[PDB]
Design an enzyme around this catalytic site. Structure first.
Site, PDB file in Angstrom:
ATOM      1  CD  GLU B  69      24.195 -89.549 -51.009  1.00 60.86           C
ATOM      2  OE1 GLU B  69      23.258 -90.310 -50.355  1.00 60.86           O
ATOM      3  OE2 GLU B  69      23.900 -88.280 -51.111  1.00 60.86           O
ATOM      4  CD  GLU B 145      18.606 -91.626 -49.998  1.00 66.40           C
ATOM      5  OE1 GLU B 145      18.351 -91.122 -50.976  1.00 66.40           O
ATOM      6  OE2 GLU B 145      19.629 -91.776 -49.102  1.00 66.40           O
ATOM      7  CE1 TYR B 146       9.453 -97.617 -53.072  1.00 67.29           C
ATOM      8  CE2 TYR B 146      10.684 -97.740 -50.816  1.00 67.29           C
ATOM      9  CZ  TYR B 146       9.545 -97.731 -51.611  1.00 67.29           C
ATOM     10  OH  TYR B 146       8.276 -98.200 -50.744  1.00 67.29           O
ATOM     11  CG  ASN B 205      20.340 -71.294 -52.747  1.00 66.44           C
ATOM     12  OD1 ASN B 205      19.141 -71.759 -53.486  1.00 66.44           O
ATOM     13  ND2 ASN B 205      20.550 -69.848 -53.066  1.00 66.44           N
ATOM     14  CG  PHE B 209      16.964 -81.299 -54.375  1.00 66.18           C
ATOM     15  CD1 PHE B 209      18.157 -82.099 -54.004  1.00 66.18           C
ATOM     16  CD2 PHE B 209      15.998 -81.807 -55.453  1.00 66.18           C
ATOM     17  CE1 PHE B 209      18.143 -83.435 -54.519  1.00 66.18           C
ATOM     18  CE2 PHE B 209      16.273 -83.194 -55.743  1.00 66.18           C
ATOM     19  CZ  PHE B 209      17.667 -83.850 -55.339  1.00 66.18           C
TER      20      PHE B 209
HETATM   21 NA    NA Z   1      16.918 -83.592 -50.810  1.00 63.21          NA
END
Ligand code: NA
Ligand SMILES: O=C1O[C@H](CO)[C@H](O)[C@H](O)[C@H]1O
Ligand SMILES: [Mg+2]
Ligand SMILES: [Mg+2]
Ligand SMILES: [Mg+2]
Ligand code: NA
Ligand code: NA
Ligand code: NA
Ligand code: NA
Lengths: 1015, 211, 174
Positions: B69, B145-146, B205, B209
């Protein structure tokens, strides 16, 4: 903290508080002033008189200097190199570093230049906006203070360092203090073969920008298949507060005509999950039938970049010259505007004999003019980004430019020790990236270079990819690690030969013709360096150009190099002379190896320049019967400023001449039918000479400029008529020590002990100061000596082979000396052997026939031992008593020419002052030869035959014993060397034998004949 | 880069490892503001080069990653090429700037779906089956990622594995992720409980997540 | 010069005096120990009880700490994250930076962890060879002193930072 941090011994600190690099800015506040490129009130020069003090180390600098002028300091002009004002010595070293190799450290004794300037800043500059200082060139590192307060630090000697002074300045009087270090960790990346100097050697300026400003802009031009349509793409970046009312307008101008314009608010397209650049905008302008830029026709447009409000209030304008051109490599060829280039290039260092490495416009213009006048179309920035005006001038005059990062680590062992080290990647990256950011909008720059002589390291690969990613418009080249690595788009060797392989381990230099077709190879080949022009050189230049023209993928090269790096020193009488390595006390040094130019430091041409001009001609010629075929090598321009002059002469006597206009399309052909030439009234060879003349003056040339020439032999009528029989018969007189011959007022004396002609008399005045003797040696050329470093005593070099074989030591031993009286002549027969320690090197057998008409016919037959090194020459020499004003010859000229460097010379009747028959190479050697000579005239003397000669007041002995041209002294008479045969001069490089086999004197047996008479 | 023992254990037990540079600039606007800036090349280069210098002898490491990212900047291209030059034994991957840039040997999307396209501007997440056969595309596809395993999740997991098995060039992926990032806190009685974002007074925050 | 330079607000300075990176070393002096991957006498762990103090900023760090243990400091286990010892709060944020986005600058309120350790070095290490210190992970940047003298600086939270301590070490307590 400054002395404590020692930032100059840390390759991880290359700057502190330095602003981002960008294209040339002027911050115009009027768009019309931007368009016309007139001066900007917002860009001031700080060039002129500064204060300067020299210190042996940064630790020796007093703290008072930061806030107060040192009374002991001198007033000096800036820009300058402090060596050129005499504060310390400039050093000439080639490969070996001028400091001990101990990276990242430099000597504790590190010459420190303390510059300062008291100057005014108007209050308006400080009430709003941003005031920055720009140092275009500081060698090699510096700290900056403003009003006693520390501002920042900078490295890289060859790119601008900029700092924001807004918070440092006051209205009225202000003081800058600049501490310049001669040596830094930066020096490890600055091992160019040149004088090692230091100081503020480029322009200093102040630039005012608004708070909301253009901070960067990139111009790109892309084309359709036939170049009938272009899109100009202009990316513009801002700094300051982002606002909806902000706009950018990019307008494009051809003269006073606006051709296209675009306007948009800020905010780029979405590029990732986080959006786009809100502080950027890209403008796209369509241009139908763009006028294309090339070195042939440097068509330029003007781009004006206006930062403004929605309703047209201007904030500021920047601008550049735009050349519409595409550079691409396709199918193994470098294409400009879809056409394969042929690079007539030269390497050019920034050098001035008085000012050192300071460049001025006059010198730069003088160079460009000379380059273009001599059929160069390209230049390499060896080996650093240049003074910014250089690119503007190349844009406008039309030269192709290789822009090269300031990275050379030649002296490292192995060469890639630093460039393969990731610790040195940051320092290297800034030299590459800050160059691209500065110069990417210049149309003249067609190729980026990663530097020179730094091996091949992983850092090169990383930076190669960075450029490819950031600017896909230009190929990237780099020669290190064997010239064909993964870090180069172009096979770019240095001194690779035409036909001869030099198969060095790991980095072989293949024959250029061979290199192209190596299994799997498809790239174009352009030599980044070739034809090393050191002293009497450029032998074999024509071989390169024949190959360039024959092989599509051989697309030329860059000669090494443009200008001798000699410097002016003054003797006790205050008379200037040209100095090289070691002449300033600099040690170790590499002597004359800094003088490799086609021109002297003062831009006077060396003889080799004309050989380059001729071989680099843009018109080719063939002759068939009465028809001349003219072929154009221009890719874009028609021959609209050219006429063909032709002349036929019989052994120098003009028979007929005419003119025909040239009307040849690019790559086209024109056939010119010559009129029926009258038949010659006598015996001899008819010669046709053609010259291409430019009737009109150009930006780069005067009216009547000669751009191209060629010669051919036409009909020959050999003389079959015998000379009118004379009444007189020469009389032979014999003594123990002499054979004398007398005829009228003429006398010849042959010494019976030496076996040579020791004297001749006209009337009873002596003609000789030294006897007529065989000579098999020459005062060694730089190519003969073959050293790139002063320390090397190379046994392979021609001079060393000659010395070891005793060629310079060999004494003539008399074998035969007889005299016979014939019906109408006296015949003297001689034989000599030249031996060295029991070895017979040469045998010379001669006859001298003196007839009743006063002519002496000399027949010479030489044997050369097959196992002795091939001799430099096979000829005769004597010191004549005559010193006459003029030299007149029927042969090749008018300039100095040698067997492997005579293509530019023309056969004709030449007449020059004696002084023009000597070439003043700064390091003296054999010089001034003219070849293919059938007749030579000097004073009362005439020599006829087929020979090479040189003629001067300097003996071969003096020339070889003397290191500097200003130390030579005219000898008593005139030394004449008449050669039957003379070795090539070579020059493919100057550090190994470079004379091609066909120009070596290897035939074993040699014959020549000469007639000596009075006229 | 992980604790050095991780690579030793992966060598010995046998797991394939993607070793990834400590570079993430997700919060930048746009994501590549730093990674396209030459001023940040030195800092970025040390995160990549010093990783390779440390871990290049581990057999478990089979692929290098340039981070995550950080959009796609010219600094990624320079560093991509640096690795390919220094270590030709391992492919280099990087997902930033649309998962299939010039800085990746592997099409390595995050949360690209099996059959459904998500055609975001600039950085679309194509159906993985579709991605493979885009005009000119020849590279393998492995999702970096998946299957975001957050709470009651992994619905549709079987759909990925059916496609992985049918398509030779769909060579799998890396689930996000292994372990919940919850932390232990203690209440009035000294009884432990699982805490997430915000439970330490941390603000702003992103709550649960992290799990 | 440490407080004055602010090397932690300069992306051009990622380290000072840090040694080159390399694969895992143990400097065995026995080939059989190398082969079997057994412990090396030349590779010592400094894990265990250290001294620690928390400060709101590096400007708040007393100069006395360089040459003398702080009496108000605590004894803590290293390796550790100091948030896990309750000195300040861990922050969970996803995309949004925990600090104002203003590169290269960080907040003036910058939690500073002051770690210290008194240790002995065996005699033979002082007479010959090179003694380095290896920090496998320090989050996010640090300066290092040995016996009151400045050694170096390092960034990157996730790779080892190594420093030559040879010229800094003395007999007895360091
Ligand atoms: Na996360
Ligand atoms: O290869 C080279 O040869 C030249 C010798 O004069 C000069 O040293 C150049 O800078 C170098 O690139
Ligand atoms: Mg430095
Ligand atoms: Mg060199
Ligand atoms: Mg830093
Ligand atoms: Na060619
Ligand atoms: Na040279
Ligand atoms: Na000489
Ligand atoms: Na598959």
């Amino acid at each position: 903290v400054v002395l404590q941090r020692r930032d100059w011994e840390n390759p991880g600190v290359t700057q502190l508080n330095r602003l981002a690099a960008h294209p040339p800015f002027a911050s115009w506040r009027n768009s019309e002033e931007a368009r016309t490129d007139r001066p900007s009130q917002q860009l001031r020069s700080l060039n002129g008189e500064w204060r300067f003090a020299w210190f042996p180390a940064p630790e020796a600098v007093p703290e008072s200097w930061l806030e107060c002028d040192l009374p002991e300091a001198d007033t000096v002009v800036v820009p300058s190199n402090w060596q050129m004002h005499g504060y310390d010595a400039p050093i000439y070293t080639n490969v070996t570093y001028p400091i001990t190799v101990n990276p990242p450290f430099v000597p504790t004794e590190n010459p420190t230049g303390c510059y300062s300037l008291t100057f005014n800043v108007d209050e308006s500059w400080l009430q709003e906006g941003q005031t920055r200082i720009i140092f275009d060139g500081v060698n090699s590192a510096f700290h900056l203070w403003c009003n006693g307060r520390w501002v920042g630090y900078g490295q890289d000697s060859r790119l601008p360092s900029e700092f924001d002074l807004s918070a440092f300045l006051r209205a009225g009087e202000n003081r800058l203090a600049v501490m310049v270090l001669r040596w830094s960790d930066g020096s490890y990346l600055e091992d160019q073969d040149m004088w090692r100097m230091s100081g503020i050697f480029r322009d200093v300026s102040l630039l005012h920008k608004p708070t909301t400003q253009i901070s960067d802009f990139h111009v790109a031009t892309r084309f359709n298949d036939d170049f009938s349509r272009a899109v100009l793409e202009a990316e513009v970046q801002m700094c300051g507060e982002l606002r909806d009312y902000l706009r950018v307008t990019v307008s494009l101008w051809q003269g006073e005509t606006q051709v296209a314009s675009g306007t948009a608010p800020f905010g780029g397209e979405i590029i990732d999950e986080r959006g786009g650049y809100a502080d950027r905008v890209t403008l796209r302008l369509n241009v139908e039938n763009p006028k294309l830029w090339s070195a042939e026709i440097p068509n330029l447009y003007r781009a004006v970049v206006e930062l403004h409000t929605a309703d047209g209030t201007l904030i500021e304008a920047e601008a550049c010259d735009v050349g519409f051109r595409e550079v691409r490599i396709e199918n193994g060829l470098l294409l400009l505007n879809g056409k394969p280039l042929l690079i007539r290039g030269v390497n050019r260092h920034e050098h001035h004999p008085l000012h050192g490495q300071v460049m001025d416009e006059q010198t730069m213009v003088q160079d460009i003019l000379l380059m273009k006048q001599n059929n160069f179309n390209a230049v390499r920035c060896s080996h650093y980004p240049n003074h910014p005006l250089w690119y503007t001038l190349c844009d406008r005059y039309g030269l192709y430019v290789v822009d090269e990062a300031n990275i050379e680590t030649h002296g490292m062992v192995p060469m890639n020790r630093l460039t393969d080290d990731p610790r040195w990647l940051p320092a290297m990256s800034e030299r590459v990236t800050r160059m691209v950011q500065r110069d990417r909008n210049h149309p003249s720059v067609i190729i980026w270079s990663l530097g020179t002589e730094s091996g091949h390291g992983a850092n090169h690969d990383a930076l190669y990819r960075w450029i490819k990613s950031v600017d896909p418009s230009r190929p990237v080249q780099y020669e290190g690690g064997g010239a064909d690595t993964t870090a180069t788009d172009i096979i770019c060797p240095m001194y690779a030969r035409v036909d001869e392989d030099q198969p060095f381990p790991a980095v072989p230099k293949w024959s250029i013709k061979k290199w192209l077709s190596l299994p799997g190879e498809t790239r174009p080949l352009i030599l980044c360096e070739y034809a090393h022009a050191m002293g009497n050189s450029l032998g074999g230049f024509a071989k390169y150009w024949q190959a360039f023209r024959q092989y599509p993928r051989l697309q030329g090269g860059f000669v090494w190099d443009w200008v001798d790096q000699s410097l002016i020193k003054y003797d006790e009488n205050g008379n200037p002379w040209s100095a090289y390595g070691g002449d300033f006390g600099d040690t170790p040094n590499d002597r004359q190896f800094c003088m490799n130019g086609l021109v002297f430091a003062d831009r006077t041409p060396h003889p080799a320049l004309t050989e380059a001009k001729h071989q680099q001609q843009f018109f080719q010629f063939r002759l068939s019967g009465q028809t001349i075929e003219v072929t154009s090598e221009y890719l874009f321009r028609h021959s609209d400023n050219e006429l063909l002059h032709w002349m036929v002469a019989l052994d120098g006597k003009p028979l007929a001449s005419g003119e025909v206009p040239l009307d040849v399309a690019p790559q086209g052909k024109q056939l010119i039918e010559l009129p029926e030439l009258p038949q010659p009234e006598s015996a001899g060879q008819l010669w046709l000479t053609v010259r291409v003349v430019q009737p009109n003056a150009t930006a780069w040339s005067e009216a009547g400029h000669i751009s191209a020439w060629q010669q051919w032999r036409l009909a020959e009528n050999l003389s079959v008529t015998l000379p009118a029989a004379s009444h007189a018969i020469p009389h032979l007189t014999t003594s123990e020590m002499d054979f004398c011959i007398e005829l009228g007022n003429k006398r010849w004396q042959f010494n019976r002990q030496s076996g040579f002609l020791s004297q001749m008399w006209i009337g009873d005045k002596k003609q000789l100061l030294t006897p007529l003797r065989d000579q098999f040696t020459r005062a060694p050329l730089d190519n003969d000596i073959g050293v790139s470093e002063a320390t090397r005593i190379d046994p392979n070099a021609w001079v060393e082979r000659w010395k070891a074989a005793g060629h310079y030591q060999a004494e003539a031993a008399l074998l035969q000396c007889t005299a016979d009286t014939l019906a109408d002549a006296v015949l003297i027969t001689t034989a000599h052997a030249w031996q060295h320690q029991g070895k017979t090197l040469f045998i010379s057998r001669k006859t001298y026939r003196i007839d009743g008409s006063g002519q002496m016919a000399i027949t010479v037959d030489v044997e050369v031992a097959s196992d002795t090194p091939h001799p430099a020459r096979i000829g005769l020499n004597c010191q004549l008593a005559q010193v006459a004003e003029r030299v007149n010859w029927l042969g090749l000229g008018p300039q100095e020419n040698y067997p492997d460097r005579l293509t530019a010379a023309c056969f004709d009747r030449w007449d020059l002052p004696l002084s023009d028959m000597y070439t003043p190479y700064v390091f003296p050697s054999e010089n001034g030869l003219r070849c293919g000579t059938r007749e030579l005239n000097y004073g009362p003397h005439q020599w006829r035959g087929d020979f090479q000669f040189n003629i001067s007041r300097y003996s071969q002995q003096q020339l070889m014993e003397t290191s500097h041209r200003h130390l030579l002294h005219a000898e008593e008479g005139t030394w004449l060397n008449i050669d039957g045969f003379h070795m090539g001069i070579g020059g493919d490089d100057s550090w190994s034998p470079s004379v091609s086999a066909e120009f070596q004197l290897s035939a074993g047996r040699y014959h020549y004949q000469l007639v000596w008479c009075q006229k």
